[PDB]
Design an enzyme around this catalytic site. Structure first.
Site, PDB file in Angstrom:
ATOM      1  N   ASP A 108      13.540  11.904   9.812  1.00  0.00           N
ATOM      2  CA  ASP A 108      12.469  10.928   9.600  1.00  0.00           C
ATOM      3  C   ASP A 108      13.069   9.540   9.290  1.00  0.00           C
ATOM      4  O   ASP A 108      12.547   8.510   9.762  1.00  0.00           O
ATOM      5  CB  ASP A 108      11.636  11.339   8.385  1.00  0.00           C
ATOM      6  CG  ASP A 108      10.233  10.775   8.382  1.00  0.00           C
ATOM      7  OD1 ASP A 108      10.043   9.668   7.851  1.00  0.00           O
ATOM      8  OD2 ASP A 108       9.306  11.492   8.823  1.00  0.00           O
ATOM      9  N   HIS A 109      14.182   9.530   8.500  1.00  0.00           N
ATOM     10  CA  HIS A 109      14.843   8.308   8.046  1.00  0.00           C
ATOM     11  C   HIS A 109      15.727   7.688   9.135  1.00  0.00           C
ATOM     12  O   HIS A 109      16.197   6.569   8.967  1.00  0.00           O
ATOM     13  CB  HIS A 109      15.562   8.546   6.708  1.00  0.00           C
ATOM     14  CG  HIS A 109      14.596   8.821   5.574  1.00  0.00           C
ATOM     15  ND1 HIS A 109      15.032   9.002   4.271  1.00  0.00           N
ATOM     16  CD2 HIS A 109      13.240   8.955   5.600  1.00  0.00           C
ATOM     17  CE1 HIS A 109      13.939   9.212   3.550  1.00  0.00           C
ATOM     18  NE2 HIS A 109      12.831   9.157   4.306  1.00  0.00           N
ATOM     19  N   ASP A 110      15.863   8.367  10.287  1.00  0.00           N
ATOM     20  CA  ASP A 110      16.522   7.829  11.474  1.00  0.00           C
ATOM     21  C   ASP A 110      15.407   7.209  12.395  1.00  0.00           C
ATOM     22  O   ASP A 110      15.698   6.354  13.231  1.00  0.00           O
ATOM     23  CB  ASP A 110      17.206   8.968  12.248  1.00  0.00           C
ATOM     24  CG  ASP A 110      18.201   8.538  13.332  1.00  0.00           C
ATOM     25  OD1 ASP A 110      18.302   7.322  13.608  1.00  0.00           O
ATOM     26  OD2 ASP A 110      18.875   9.412  13.890  1.00  0.00           O
TER      27      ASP A 110
HETATM   28  C1  HEM Z   1      12.625  14.662  -1.442  1.00  0.00           C
HETATM   29  C2  HEM Z   1      11.547  14.919  -0.703  1.00  0.00           C
HETATM   30  C3  HEM Z   1      10.659  13.803  -0.247  1.00  0.00           C
HETATM   31  C4  HEM Z   1      10.217  12.746  -0.947  1.00  0.00           C
HETATM   32  C5  HEM Z   1      10.474  12.403  -2.419  1.00  0.00           C
HETATM   33  C6  HEM Z   1       9.384  11.991  -0.032  1.00  0.00           C
HETATM   34  C7  HEM Z   1       8.711  10.826  -0.448  1.00  0.00           C
HETATM   35  C8  HEM Z   1       7.921  10.068   0.434  1.00  0.00           C
HETATM   36  C9  HEM Z   1       7.292   8.887   0.066  1.00  0.00           C
HETATM   37  C10 HEM Z   1       7.112   8.316  -1.324  1.00  0.00           C
HETATM   38  C11 HEM Z   1       6.885   8.318   1.197  1.00  0.00           C
HETATM   39  C12 HEM Z   1       6.126   6.990   1.262  1.00  0.00           C
HETATM   40  C13 HEM Z   1       4.679   7.321   0.751  1.00  0.00           C
HETATM   41  C14 HEM Z   1       3.621   6.240   1.038  1.00  0.00           C
HETATM   42  O1  HEM Z   1       2.952   6.141   2.197  1.00  0.00           O
HETATM   43  O2  HEM Z   1       3.324   5.401   0.186  1.00  0.00           O
HETATM   44  C15 HEM Z   1       7.216   9.183   2.258  1.00  0.00           C
HETATM   45  C16 HEM Z   1       7.023   8.872   3.593  1.00  0.00           C
HETATM   46  C17 HEM Z   1       7.265   9.707   4.593  1.00  0.00           C
HETATM   47  N1  HEM Z   1       7.867  10.900   4.478  1.00  0.00           N
HETATM   48 FE1  HEM Z   1       8.215  11.973   2.822  1.00  0.00          FE
HETATM   49  N2  HEM Z   1       9.329  12.549   1.212  1.00  0.00           N
HETATM   50  C18 HEM Z   1      10.094  13.644   1.134  1.00  0.00           C
HETATM   51  C19 HEM Z   1      10.274  14.554   2.129  1.00  0.00           C
HETATM   52  C20 HEM Z   1       9.834  14.388   3.392  1.00  0.00           C
HETATM   53  C21 HEM Z   1      10.098  15.325   4.447  1.00  0.00           C
HETATM   54  C22 HEM Z   1      10.847  16.641   4.266  1.00  0.00           C
HETATM   55  C23 HEM Z   1       9.537  14.786   5.602  1.00  0.00           C
HETATM   56  C24 HEM Z   1       9.528  15.273   6.939  1.00  0.00           C
HETATM   57  C25 HEM Z   1       9.999  16.389   7.416  1.00  0.00           C
HETATM   58  C26 HEM Z   1       9.030  13.480   5.221  1.00  0.00           C
HETATM   59  C27 HEM Z   1       8.638  12.534   6.108  1.00  0.00           C
HETATM   60  C28 HEM Z   1       8.175  11.278   5.707  1.00  0.00           C
HETATM   61  C29 HEM Z   1       7.901  10.154   6.661  1.00  0.00           C
HETATM   62  C30 HEM Z   1       8.325  10.097   8.081  1.00  0.00           C
HETATM   63  C31 HEM Z   1       7.228   9.239   5.980  1.00  0.00           C
HETATM   64  C32 HEM Z   1       6.863   7.869   6.525  1.00  0.00           C
HETATM   65  C33 HEM Z   1       8.124   6.971   6.552  1.00  0.00           C
HETATM   66  C34 HEM Z   1       7.780   5.552   6.942  1.00  0.00           C
HETATM   67  O3  HEM Z   1       7.644   4.565   6.078  1.00  0.00           O
HETATM   68  O4  HEM Z   1       7.593   5.269   8.087  1.00  0.00           O
HETATM   69  N3  HEM Z   1       9.094  13.305   3.857  1.00  0.00           N
HETATM   70  N4  HEM Z   1       7.764  10.357   1.804  1.00  0.00           N
HETATM   71 CA   LIG Z   2      17.032   5.433  14.725  1.00  0.00          CA
END
Ligand code: HEM
Ligand SMILES: [Ca+2]
Ligand SMILES: *[C@@H]1O[C@H](CO[C@@H]2O[C@@H](C)[C@@H](O)[C@@H](O)[C@@H]2O)[C@@H](O[C@@H]2O[C@H](CO)[C@@H](O[C@@H]3O[C@H](CO[C@H]4O[C@H](CO)[C@@H](O)[C@H](O)[C@@H]4O)[C@@H](O)[C@H](O[C@H]4O[C@H](CO)[C@@H](O)[C@H](O)[C@@H]4O)[C@@H]3O)[C@H](O)[C@H]2NC(C)=O)[C@H](O)[C@H]1NC(C)=O
Ligand SMILES: Nc1cc([C@H]2CCN[C@H]3C[C@H](Cc4ccccc4)[C@@H](C3)Oc3cccc(c3)Cn3cc2cn3)c2nn[nH]c2n1
Ligand SMILES: *[C@@H]1O[C@H](CO)[C@@H](O[C@@H]2O[C@H](CO)[C@@H](O)[C@H](O)[C@H]2NC(C)=O)[C@H](O)[C@H]1NC(C)=O
Ligand SMILES: *[C@@H]1O[C@H](CO)[C@@H](O)[C@H](O)[C@H]1NC(C)=O
Ligand SMILES: [Cl-]
Ligand SMILES: [Cl-]
Lengths: 103, 464
Positions: free
Chosen positions: A94-96
């Site tokens: 997701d972070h890529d």
């Molecule tokens: C350690 C586990 C995880 C978190 C702690 C975590 C936290 C977040 C938060 C706070 C956001 C932003 C929330 C908002 O809209 O205000 C967030 C965004 C997204 N996540 Fe989360 N995440 C954890 C774990 C996961 C896993 C395992 C994911 C997918 C398999 C996952 C995905 C995402 C994505 C893609 C987003 C949006 C990112 C963006 O800004 O575009 N997360 N998560």
């Molecule tokens: Ca990328």
């Protein structure tokens, strides 16, 4: 936009030679469906008290979480076929792909 | 200040508190929320849209960065070995740790007031949100340097730039192979995998590779996989006492736990040998993220599921039915109809009570509510959104690892041998890793093997 290259740029610019910003960083997301805002162009549903969405009141995000998501931690079901590495690769991947900036 | 105000004034869109909340008794309080940055600020013409700060490509930009000044800063510019910068103050049993960031407002310093360990610095800014994420970033940092060293001995004539780029290219390809060969089949299941990701043919320059706004919310299905603890295990894969199960609300931004509590090896072991939480229709997401998200760095614990729903509204995403229709899936109009789709009447009743119509169910909520596809961990709606996105990232990427001219036939044959367990073997003190598939394998010792049995990446075809 160079005619021949061996490596990706850092920004992703020039990966697509006809539209060189496609997939590049710091650009608007593509939309697969037109957006739906309370005023049609900017205000989110739930912004204005009393303003219904498609004939129904907007549910508070916290109320949905309390009523549908909330469950006793002691009840947790471990997945017999998935590691926590499955969860961690997901967030790493997701972070890529995307980071949506805030002010 | 969105962080401390409850006033709905742009750019603040605070989450209101319902009556009889199980945690927040003060109805004049709120869960803080900043609206995502608009692509066109102040416009009364354009339909508000959001920004992707990253490269959409599966190119390991979370390692290298998506902006040139940051990418330069993450490199070790003190020589011509083409390496990424490593921590200068600390090491992990003589192994590299990520450098620290020079943040003015460092959240990591608040997780342990005495430890004074700041946030790490990686390609993506969120590298310190949880130590398990930090560990994966560290693992990949080490893999680049290991590759950049192994290429210098093969080609002494290559300068820094060439060594950095060639190692970057391999790392990028490893992320693609692990994602599409091992990860995505287990997210989608075999039928959705064949439907949305048929056998690769070649690059197609008419395939738009951008991230769709909906994907940013749909890919948050991963929140249903999150365990309420961070599990740490010793070299014998036994609970690492003291504190082998630290609650998640005590690990967020706790970079100190990586420096002072054993490095990344106990964390990686815990990831491999602990099962993921299973998404169930009455067990969607845990209170460590639903009640206590980032509670030791903020004025109030947040609610990640609620944040997801408020975010989809902020982003103006259409509701559940519009997305079911986009995917070519039936659109339930009522509680009885939704009951059928969800194969769960109690859940449909709960959804309908909240939303009134399946037209209004927020995309994340509706998506994670769906019964899981066979051998997959998402329902039909999310399988469609996720599968469609990853096909575009693959067919729309000119530098996709299998595309003609990116790598040679021999280099591709060599790359096919990579695996995440082998990456763990070459960059840590771990000698016993998960058997392939690493995402399925979760029980020690039943699903574990010795590193010696795992084939390494043969770099012979990289000799110039
Ligand atoms: C350690 C586990 C995880 C978190 C702690 C975590 C936290 C977040 C938060 C706070 C956001 C932003 C929330 C908002 O809209 O205000 C967030 C965004 C997204 N996540 Fe989360 N995440 C954890 C774990 C996961 C896993 C395992 C994911 C997918 C398999 C996952 C995905 C995402 C994505 C893609 C987003 C949006 C990112 C963006 O800004 O575009 N997360 N998560
Ligand atoms: Ca990328
Ligand atoms: C390279 O990729 C191109 C993109 O392909 C898409 O993405 C990849 C990842 C896959 O998922 C793939 O399945 C996707 O299609 C690809 O070009 C695409 O080719 C298709 C098929 O030729 C095109 O579809 C046609 O579209 C026209 C125009 O209308 C479209 O756009 C409007 C506006 O958004 C919509 O309202 C419409 O519903 C359409 O989506 C249609 O007129 C046409 O349908 C008519 O004709 C067919 C038979 O010819 C009949 O069966 C129908 O009933 C209709 O009478 C098609 O639907 C698509 O537009 C085009 N996209 C782009 C961006 O060019 C290309 O072919 C790939 N090349 C190779 C060699 O692989
Ligand atoms: N879109 C998105 C956002 C975030 C936020 C969450 C924290 N918000 C506040 C709470 C603290 C105050 C913090 C920000 O201070 C930070 C300061 C500097 C950089 C960061 C964080 C980088 N950064 C941003 C996230 C995590 N790391 C996130 N986390 N995991 N996935 C995510 N996706
Ligand atoms: C913050 O980190 C410190 C280490 O820097 C932890 O302190 C140790 O605590 C144990 C008892 O819990 C003592 O035996 C050690 O001597 C302590 N070490 C130092 C250097 O003080 C501390 O537990 C952590 N704090 C929290 C709140 O988790
Ligand atoms: C650069 O590389 C050398 C040799 O490996 C190493 O000793 C030094 O610490 C590196 N510098 C940084 C900032 O990583
Ligand atoms: Cl969209
Ligand atoms: Cl440093």
């Amino acid at each position: 936009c160079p005619e021949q290259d061996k490596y990706r740029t850092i920004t992703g610019m020039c990966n697509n030679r006809r539209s060189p910003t496609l997939g590049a960083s710091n650009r608007a997301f593509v939309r697969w469906l037109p957006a739906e805002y309370e005023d049609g162009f900017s205000l989110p549903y739930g912004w204005t008290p009393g303003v219904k969405r498609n004939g129904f009141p907007v549910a508070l995000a916290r109320a949905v979480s309390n009523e549908i998501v909330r469950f006793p931690t002691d009840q947790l079901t471990p997945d017999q076929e998935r590691s926590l590495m499955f969860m961690q690769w997901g967030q790493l991947l997701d972070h890529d792909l995307d980071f949506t900036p805030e002010p | 200040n969105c962080e401390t105000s409850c006033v709905q004034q742009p750019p603040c869109f605070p989450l209101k508190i319902p009556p009889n909340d199980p945690r927040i008794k003060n109805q004049a309080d709120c869960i803080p929320f900043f609206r995502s940055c608009p692509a066109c600020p102040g416009s009364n013409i354009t339909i508000r849209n959001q920004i992707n700060a990253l490269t959409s490509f599966v190119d390991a930009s979370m390692v290298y960065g998506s902006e040139e000044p940051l990418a330069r800063n993450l490199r070790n510019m003190s020589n011509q070995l083409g390496l990424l910068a490593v921590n200068q103050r600390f090491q992990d049993n003589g192994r590299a740790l990520l450098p620290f960031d020079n943040l003015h407002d460092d959240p990591c310093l608040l997780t342990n007031r005495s430890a004074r360990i700041p946030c790490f610095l990686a390609g993506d800014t969120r590298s310190s949100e949880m130590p398990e994420l930090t560990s994966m970033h560290t693992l990949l940092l080490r893999e680049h340097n290991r590759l950049a060293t192994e290429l210098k001995s093969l080609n002494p004539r290559w300068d820094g730039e060439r060594l950095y780029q060639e190692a970057r290219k391999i790392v990028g390809a490893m992320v693609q192979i692990i994602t599409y060969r091992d990860y995505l089949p287990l997210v989608l299941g075999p039928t959705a995998m064949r439907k949305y990701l048929p056998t690769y043919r070649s690059y197609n320059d008419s395939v738009d590779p951008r991230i769709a706004n909906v994907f940013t919310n749909a890919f948050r299905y991963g929140h249903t996989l999150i365990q309420p603890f961070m599990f740490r295990l010793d070299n014998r894969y036994q609970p690492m006492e003291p504190n082998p199960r630290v609650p998640l609300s005590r690990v967020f931004f706790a970079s100190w736990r990586v420096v002072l509590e054993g490095g990344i090896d106990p964390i990686l072991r815990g990831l491999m040998a602990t099962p993921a939480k299973l998404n169930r229709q009455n067990q969607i997401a845990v209170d460590e993220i639903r009640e206590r998200l980032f509670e030791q760095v903020m004025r109030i614990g947040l609610d990640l599921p609620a944040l997801n729903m408020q975010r989809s509204r902020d982003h103006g995403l259409p509701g559940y039915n519009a997305w079911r229709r986009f995917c070519g899936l039936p659109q339930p109009e009522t509680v009885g109809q939704l009951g059928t789709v969800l194969r769960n009447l109690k859940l449909a009743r709960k959804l309908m009570e909240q939303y009134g119509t399946p037209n209004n169910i927020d995309i994340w909520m509706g998506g994670v509510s769906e019964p899981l596809k066979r051998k997959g961990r998402v329902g039909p709606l999310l399988a469609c959104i996720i599968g469609t996105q990853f096909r575009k990232l693959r067919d729309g990427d000119r530098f996709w690892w299998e595309n003609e001219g990116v790598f040679s036939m021999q280099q591709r044959q060599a790359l096919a041998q990579i695996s995440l367990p082998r990456i763990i073997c070459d960059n840590t003190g771990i000698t016993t890793v998960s058997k392939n598939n690493i995402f399925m394998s979760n029980s020690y010792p039943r699903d574990f093997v010795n590193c010696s049995t795992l084939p390494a990446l043969n770099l012979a075809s990289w000799r110039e």
